């Protein structure tokens, strides 16, 4: 019980900031995650032995893809940790437990391809799950790992606490489908502006957790410019692979995904900041005022990508 994870001093202090980068040392990532669980949730939330076996099974079911990998999983968890820590009193015990595990598991067994490519390939997962295809698969893999022997970190919840937390995790992971983000955010925008937003209404809580998930998942856009720029190479490495596979199906890919049209990246990042990221972190800052540094970092990086187009870098 009295066995704490501690971090070196620089990490101990920077982990508390939204723009923290987990660094290049893979073998420190499990311990950074447990560190985050203990401070967010408590040293009692999970049996450490179970939690470690769960984390190491989660890690093994992430593939070696340029972006949708174990490092993404941990990075997305860390954003959720910073959000929860700056909003201490707004979330229940079950929610903090659930949300850190959903972030860690939200892209399980990702092959680095969109739902659109699965549907055009005619992949078996597309006939199994017509909408949010990869995300119904990420939730399925999560449930599978929980049911391996000695991996059930929720075993000490009541039956009904257990069902609540798997329902928090399923909605949180489904919410990472960006096709669902647009409508969810518009709805939240309307409820905020007409002041009908009500955090004691479950349906409203679900929508706010959804937006937090989108915000955590996109958090590469909120890092210090050098991190955000180097991450965008991994992002585009996956898009260009997908574009290559589209061309093999006789389908010309959008220029963003076409590895002959790299010039069109900066403007494809601007479109993504203006159409997706800025509005996301704006609505989030309106409902959760302490997440304001995410919107500021995102505005800073939008401005860095504008500079890239203007030829200044």
Binding site, annotated residues for a divalent metal cation: 72, 106-107, 217
Q: Which of 19, 68, 137, 151 is the catalytic position?
A: 68
The interface mask with ligand IZQ, positions 121-160, x = CB under 6 A, is ----------------------------------------
Show the DSSP H helices in the chain as ranges: 9-14, 29-40, 48-60, 70-86, 93-105, 115-121, 124-128, 133-146, 159-174, 178-193, 202-217, 225-248, 265-272, 278-287, 292-309
Q: Binding mask 214-253 vs Zn ion (x if CB under 5 A, - otherwise)?
A: ---x------------------------------------
CB crowding 116-126: b at 16 or more within 10 Å, else e = ebbeeeebebb
Q: Please choose which of Mg ion, ligand IZQ, Zn ion, none residue 95 contacts, taking the beta carbon within 5 to 8 angstroms, the exact cut-off set by kind.
A: none
Binds Mg ion by CB under 5 A, chosen from 95, 107, 238, 242 = 107
CB of 69 to ligand IZQ, least distance (A): 12
Among 73, 82, 169, 235, binds ligand IZQ (CB under 6 A): 235
Dist CA 22 CA 26 (whole Å): 9
Residue number, nearest CB to Mg ion: 107
> Applying CB under 6 A, does 212 fall inside the site for ligand IZQ?
no
* Total residues in contact with Mg ion, by rule CB under 5 A: 2
> Which residue's entry shows tokens 């329902």?
167
Catalytic, 137? Answer no
Contact, 241 vs 310, CB < 8 A? Answer: no
DSSP string, 10-25: HHHHHTTSTT----S-
- Phi, psi dihedral angles at 199 (to 5 degrees): -70, -10
DSSP class of 299: H
The one among 51, 165, 169, 218 contacting ligand IZQ by CB under 6 A: 218
The minimum distance between CB 68 and ligand IZQ, in angstroms, equals: 7
Nearest one of 22, 122, 107 to 65, comparing CA atoms:
107
Q: Which of 116, 200, 213 is nearest to 169 (CA)?
A: 213
Interface positions, 261-300, toward ligand IZQ (CB under 6 A): 269, 272
Which CB sits closer to Mg ion, 21 or 107?
A: 107
Binding to ligand IZQ (CB under 6 A): which residues in 167-206? 178
Binds Mg ion (CB under 5 A): choice among 141, 176, 228, 283: 176
Can residue 220 be called a binding residue for Mg ion (CB under 5 A)?
no
CB of 189 to ligand IZQ, least distance (A): 20
Structure tokens at 105: 């598991």
Tell the smallest beta-carbon distance from residue 252 to Zn ion (Å).
Answer: 27
- Per CB under 5 A, does 107 bind Zn ion? yes
Contact 133, 119 (CB under 8 A): yes
CA atoms within 13 A on the CB side of 74: 26
Check: CB of residue 255 under 8 Å from CB of residue 264: yes
Tokens representing 42? 């408590």
Look at phi and psi of residue 195 and say left if phi exceeds 0, alpha if psi is from -120 to 50, else beta.
left
Q: Which residues in this chain contact Zn ion in the complex, by CB under 5 A?
A: 107, 217
Residues with a catalytic annotation lie at 68
User: Which residues of this protein are in contact with Mg ion, per CB under 5 A?
Assistant: 107, 176
Residues near ligand IZQ, by CB under 6 A? 178, 218, 220-221, 232, 235, 269, 272
């Amino acid at each position: 019980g009295l066995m704490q994870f501690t971090l070196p001093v620089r990490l101990c202090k920077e982990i508390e900031l939204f723009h923290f980068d987990i660094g290049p040392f893979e073998n420190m990532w499990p311990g950074i995650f447990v560190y985050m669980v203990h401070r967010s949730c408590g040293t009692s939330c999970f049996e450490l032995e179970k939690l470690c076996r769960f984390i190491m099974s989660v890690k093994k079911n992430y593939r070696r893809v340029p972006y949708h990998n174990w490092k993404h999983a941990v990075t997305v968890a860390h954003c959720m940790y910073a959000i929860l820590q700056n909003n201490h009193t707004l979330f229940t015990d079950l929610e903090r437990k659930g949300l850190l595990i959903a972030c860690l598991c939200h892209d399980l067994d990702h092959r680095g391809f969109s739902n659109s490519y699965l549907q055009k390939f005619d992949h078996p997962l597309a006939a199994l799950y017509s909408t949010s295809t990869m995300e119904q698969h990420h939730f399925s893999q999560t449930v599978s790992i929980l049911q391996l022997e000695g991996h059930n970190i929720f075993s000490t919840l009541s039956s009904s606490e257990y069902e609540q937390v798997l329902e928090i995790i399923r909605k949180a992971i489904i919410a990472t489908d960006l096709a669902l983000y647009f409508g969810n955010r518009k709805q939240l925008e309307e409820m905020y502006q007409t002041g009908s937003l009500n955090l004691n209404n479950q349906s409203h809580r679900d929508r706010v957790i959804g937006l937090m998930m989108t915000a955590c998942d996109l958090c590469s856009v909120t890092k210090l410019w050098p991190v955000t720029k180097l991450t965008a190479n991994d992002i585009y490495a996956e898009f260009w692979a997908e574009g290559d596979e589209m061309k093999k199906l006789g389908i010309q890919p959008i220029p963003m995904m076409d590895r002959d049209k790299k010039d069109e990246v900066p403007q494809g990042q601007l479109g993504f900041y203006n159409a997706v990221a800025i509005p996301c972190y704006t609505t989030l800052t309106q409902i959760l005022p302490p997440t304001e540094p995410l919107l500021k970092a995102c505005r800073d990086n939008l401005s860095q990508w504008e500079k890239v187009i203007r030829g200044e870098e």
